[PDB]
Design an enzyme around this catalytic site. Structure first.
Site, short mmCIF file in Angstrom:
data_model
loop_
_atom_site.label_atom_id
_atom_site.label_comp_id
_atom_site.label_asym_id
_atom_site.label_seq_id
_atom_site.Cartn_x
_atom_site.Cartn_y
_atom_site.Cartn_z
N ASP B 118 0.83 -1.20 0.00
CA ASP B 118 0.00 0.00 0.00
C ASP B 118 0.87 1.25 0.00
O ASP B 118 1.87 1.32 0.71
CB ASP B 118 -0.93 -0.01 1.21
CG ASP B 118 -2.22 0.76 0.96
OD1 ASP B 118 -2.15 1.98 0.69
OD2 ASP B 118 -3.30 0.15 1.03
N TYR B 152 5.60 1.41 -6.68
CA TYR B 152 4.63 2.41 -7.11
C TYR B 152 5.26 3.77 -7.41
O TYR B 152 4.53 4.70 -7.76
CB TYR B 152 3.54 2.59 -6.04
CG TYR B 152 4.05 2.50 -4.62
CD1 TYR B 152 4.72 3.57 -4.03
CD2 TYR B 152 3.84 1.36 -3.85
CE1 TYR B 152 5.18 3.50 -2.73
CE2 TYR B 152 4.30 1.28 -2.55
CZ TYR B 152 4.96 2.35 -2.00
OH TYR B 152 5.42 2.28 -0.70
N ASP B 218 0.00 12.85 6.82
CA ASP B 218 0.23 11.90 7.91
C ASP B 218 1.70 11.63 8.19
O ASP B 218 2.01 11.02 9.22
CB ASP B 218 -0.50 10.58 7.63
CG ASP B 218 -0.21 9.98 6.24
OD1 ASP B 218 0.79 10.31 5.56
OD2 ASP B 218 -1.01 9.13 5.81
#
Lengths: 424, 424
Positions: B118, B152, B218
């Site tokens: 992720d 990614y 974050d």
């Protein structure tokens, strides 16, 4: 009027909810401390809208809050800050104050706290004494009536610290059954002593009530005070008429400081001995027992979390160990990437791999904290652990970049912080 | 399959509420962007509890969320991250994946997003391609099926950036109707260009979908990205199959970046011209119109707030002016407290009084923001303004202490920050 040991809402930003204050009242009943002052900065009815009255819905909410505090067995003190521009002159705003205290008395509570400069010039001393005495005479004789002066700390008293003459005017002119708020030598209030309270008892000729700010966190970026109640002796509790504390802005993180303060009050009602580490481990065991509740992790990792985000006056054992190891890796980094020099580089790599293992286990603590049952206590604590893991990985990346042959963090706040640390 | 321009929940910590997602869906309908990917880190059902199934109550909550997204006119994409250890070997966990996608299809949605690493090793490429193709063949032919690779970004591709061979394996082996997620040259993803997307279109032989992180916050302490959507051209939107964005963890602060992204998508569906400042002032006028709502301040001060907490790639005009003035006061401070030297000290005092006036007006902005009607949008923004005012007052106190003849801030996070800025 025994002792006003309680918890205030003097912090900025967060309004605590009704169920949060209800669980706070049940914790107050089961722990021992028996006061709660209501000074929230989100509620501007007592700060600037005291010319206006209370509405029906928020008046019923405050009535439910007051009767919830009453049925829990604690007492409620309503703190109202109208400002230092009353001076008993026009008496229209004095009538507004009397109507406001009448509607708060209709809401249920009878204890009050007149504030002039809220804890976060000249020719106002005798006027504010007259205003406070006329309000206290208007309410007859309340049992617990508080008064916060403008010079609430020794750093705010401009002529010296013993006799600034404002403290001697509010000590002689006021009624003897009114308590005076105090903070200590500083507004931030670290490492306070009984000698300043003794000379304040000499000046004010009454025992004050210490609004404490050792667990407050609204004044710094990312400060969390999960540490115990430290650097306050038992005789400081002895020579007062009560002592409040200002906890963190997030309610669910305030289990351990309010429990150590409850130890510091209620165990000292019977015997004046206080162990900081025993109360800290008892509060952290009760906090793991509260951690397992699934309201919408062993004791060692939550001990690591409490020992990381300690008091502003002192860090924990693990935090001081990490700062010492970071200073040691930062200082003698010139032996890196280079017989005695080669084993010194191997020792440096051993310390750096120990640092990488510490960041790895605190990231695993972050994931294991993310798999918790409680979620509203998860979100209040996750941002501090995530930003600590990010800045620790940035520290390890900077040390590894200095090992073998700009920096933006925090945004504008971190830019100002780096601009006031870096010199010419 | 027109264009998957939407907003993800890929940030950590905060679960957005049902009414917050409902107002997000109504904003999505009224603005133009028509997608919403569901990858929240608070919901661990798709991350590690995918061996388990969904319960009745949370299943009904997800069904209500899916039908609310359906009745708003947008589409719902369920992102599930089982891990990179499937490899189609035992097929018991593949049966768990099939039962999980069956119960999510029973909940209402038909679009999915298989995630392996992720976005926040070796010999896994052909196995993950086989797993994704078998899942996509098991679901027949979904119209919008997404797939996030392990590499990614160009910083995560370890052999070079053009051909790391994992991207060429997932480009040749996968089905041509599956989209591949991407972030850019960096995971943090600042200043991306169409050339990296062009060589990725050469490698992957299909148009990817850019998960963007230009408004994510974050990963840093006190970072707030209220800036507009900048440093992305219109041809970057042209050469894709959709583009998502990862907004801030607090929902009510995300009016202006999602509105500038909605300008950047929906106005570019008709004409490829884009003004950053016109979209920024339109979004800030609509944000003052939303600011006046009393859900439980002129345009200039909220322009100052947006220009302070800008993008990570660049600060605003006011923030750069404050950093330049702080650098100028820090650099030539040796003329302070001392004919030409005396008028130079007067010029230095003029600049320092201008700095004190800037901190005074930003504290008055903090009080005027504290007197707002909306309170749930007040609390999400008040901590940043309060910590900025505190660090600006600490900056002004440090400059004034350097004018005429340690420093603890941030706690352990600020201690690590000062330990990695200060040198030997």
């Amino acid at each position: 009027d025994k002792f006003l040991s309680g918890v205030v809402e003097g912090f900025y930003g967060k309004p605590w909810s009704f169920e949060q204050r209800k669980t706070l009242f049940s914790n107050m009943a089961k722990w021992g401390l028996n006061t709660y002052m209501y000074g929230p900065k989100d509620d501007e009815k007592h700060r600037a809208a005291w010319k206006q009255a209370y509405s029906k819905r928020e008046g019923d909410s405050l009535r439910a809050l007051i009767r919830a505090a009453e049925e829990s067995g604690i007492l409620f003190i309503y703190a109202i800050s109208p400002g230092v521009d009353i001076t008993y002159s026009s008496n229209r705003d004095m009538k507004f104050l009397k109507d406001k205290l009448d509607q708060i008395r209709n809401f249920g509570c009878n204890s009050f706290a007149i504030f002039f400069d809220d804890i976060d010039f000249e020719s106002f001393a005798a006027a504010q004494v007259e205003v406070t005495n006329e309000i206290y005479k208007y309410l007859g004789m309340p049992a617990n009536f508080l008064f916060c002066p403008t010079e609430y700390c020794a750093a705010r008293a401009d002529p010296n610290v013993k006799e600034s003459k404002y403290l001697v005017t509010v000590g002689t002119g006021l009624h003897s059954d009114i308590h005076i708020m105090w903070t200590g030598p500083k507004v931030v209030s670290n490492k306070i002593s009984v000698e300043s309270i003794l000379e304040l008892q000499t000046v004010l000729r009454r025992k004050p009530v210490i609004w404490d700010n050792i667990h407050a966190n609204d004044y710094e970026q990312g400060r969390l005070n999960l540490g115990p109640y430290d650097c306050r002796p038992a005789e400081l509790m002895e020579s007062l008429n009560g002592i409040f504390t200002n906890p963190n802005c997030e309610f669910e993180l305030n289990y351990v400081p309010i429990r150590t303060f409850s130890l510091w009050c209620q165990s000292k009602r019977t015997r004046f001995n206080y162990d900081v580490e025993k109360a800290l481990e008892q509060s952290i065991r009760e906090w793991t027992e509260e951690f397992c509740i699934p309201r919408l992790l062993t004791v060692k990792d939550i001990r690591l979390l409490v020992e990381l985000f300690y008091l502003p006056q002192k860090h924990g054992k693990t935090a001081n160990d990490l700062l010492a190891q970071a200073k040691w890796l930062k200082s003698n980094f010139r032996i890196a990437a280079l017989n005695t020099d080669y084993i010194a580089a191997k020792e440096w790599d051993k310390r750096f791999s120990k640092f990488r293992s510490i960041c790895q286990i605190i990231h695993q603590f972050g994931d294991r904290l993310m798999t918790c049952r409680n979620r509203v206590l998860l979100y209040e604590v996750y941002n501090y652990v995530a930003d600590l893991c990010g800045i620790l990985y940035h520290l390890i990346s900077r040390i590894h970049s200095l090992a073998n042959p700009s920096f933006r963090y925090g945004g504008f706040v971190g830019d100002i912080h780096r601009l006031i640390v870096s010199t010419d």
